[PDB]
Nucleic acid binder design. Structure first.
Ligand SMILES: Nc1ccn([C@H]2C[C@H](O)[C@@H](COP(=O)(O)OP(=O)(O)OP(=O)(O)O)O2)c(=O)n1
Ligand SMILES: [Cl-]
Ligand SMILES: [Cl-]
Ligand SMILES: [Cl-]
Ligand SMILES: [Mg+2]
Ligand SMILES: [Mg+2]
Ligand code: NA
Ligand code: NA
Length: 326
DNA sequence: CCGACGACGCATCAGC
DNA sequence: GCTGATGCG
DNA sequence: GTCGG
């Protein structure tokens, strides 16, 4: 990767601001600069060259100059030395521990993996599962395994009701050679924006995937969103596969294209696109694109029959999923 | 200078 | 119990 | 932290 040293430094700065400083706009600003530098097709030679890119300003250009000249950033060398920041940064790597809980735990003297294991009684359900699979959740998923997982989910949903449609989204749909988790978009004709003609539509799918021992744990579960844990079956005498994170989102069937646009991401791509929509006078969520009125209040949903229709409303050329990895 | 920075589901808690 | 705010994702 | 107006 052409500018990997720079984008790694900006990512570490972003994480510092989110986890330690609890400065979410600085977190998003460093992420935006790292994203625009990541796609820049030249090896950056100066901070001035980088400042030409949108989202890189004076402060980050100065940090890039320091990094290019020395290979390091003093500000980060200090943060890495700092016990409190280091402990907080670590604890947020556990799923369900965010910046607030991480600082609370560090305040109570809970600062290592050992400390967490000893104090399991102070964790909520999600954090408990995140700790149990801390090691597994740090591993990437090879695309070959993503394909096996897709084949299980799609076949088990079909067994519940052949009218379900399950689509694997996220980085998988963008063509990534490895993924951090599996994201599944689910639809069923009995659930539309107009009516819900069947209860338990997500529940029945979750139950079936549990019955065949694919889903192993639940982090959170409502009528439309499931967050949990899953695992591929292994063969005789084979080492078990790592446990993996799985997210399932049931979307109204008539709102599939807004839903698949949202669930394909990337998250930075959606933020860029939704910000552009606002500049163009629309608001986009996972259900609808609506116009903004003279006062800025959302109007009625606009008709959408393809992902491209949403790009057309905001005057963007269509971008295939593989070109949305921002 | 200075306001705005994407949009939302589920879990948890405070206050009533 | 319900409603609203906050955390986390 | 950055940017548009
Ligand atoms: N704050 C966020 C977080 C995520 N998503 C989205 C964009 C996605 O593509 C997606 C699926 O979520 P993931 O967190 O699982 O991210 P990815 O699938 O894109 O990458 P990976 O899971 O490989 O890390 O959620 C979004 O719009 N806003
Ligand atoms: Cl901030
Ligand atoms: Cl460094
Ligand atoms: Cl809506
Ligand atoms: Mg994903
Ligand atoms: Mg996910
Ligand atoms: Na710039
Ligand atoms: Na976390």
């Amino acid at each position: 990767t052409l500018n990997g040293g720079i984008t790694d430094m900006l990512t570490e700065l972003a994480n510092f601001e989110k986890n330690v400083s609890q400065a979410i706009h600085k977190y998003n600003a460093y992420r935006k600069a790292a994203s625009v530098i990541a796609k820049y097709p030249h090896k950056i030679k100066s901070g001035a060259e980088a400042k030409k890119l949108p989202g890189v300003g004076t402060k980050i250009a100065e940090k890039i100059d320091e990094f290019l000249a020395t290979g390091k950033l003093r500000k980060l060398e200090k943060i890495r030395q700092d016990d409190t920041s280091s402990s907080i940064n670590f604890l947020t790597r556990v799923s369900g521990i965010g910046p607030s809980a991480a600082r609370k735990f560090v305040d109570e003297g809970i600062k290592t993996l050992e400390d967490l294991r000893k104090n399991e009684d102070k964790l909520n359900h999600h954090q408990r599962i995140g700790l149990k699979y801390f090691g597994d959740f740090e591993k990437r998923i090879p695309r070959e395994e993503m394909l096996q997982m897709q084949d299980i989910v799609l076949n088990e949903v079909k067994k519940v009701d052949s009218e379900y449609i399950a689509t694997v989204c996220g980085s998988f749909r963008r063509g990534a050679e490895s993924s951090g988790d599996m994201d599944v978009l689910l639809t069923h004709p009995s659930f539309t924006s107009e009516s819900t003609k069947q209860p338990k539509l997500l529940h029945q799918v979750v139950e079936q995937l549990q019955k065949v021992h694919f889903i192993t744990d639940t982090l959170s579960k409502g009528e439309t969103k499931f967050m949990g844990v899953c695992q591929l079956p292994s063969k005789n005498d084979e080492k078990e596969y790592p446990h993996r994170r799985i997210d399932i989102r049931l979307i109204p069937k008539d709102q599939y294209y807004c839903g698949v646009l949202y669930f394909t991401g990337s998250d930075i791509f959606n933020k860029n696109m939704r910000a552009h929509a606002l500049e163009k006078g629309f608001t986009i969520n996972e259900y609808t694109i609506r116009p903004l009125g003279v006062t800025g209040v959302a109007g009625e949903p606009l008709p959408v029959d393809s992902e491209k229709d949403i790009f057309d409303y905001i005057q963007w050329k269509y971008r295939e999923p593989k070109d949305r990895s921002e």
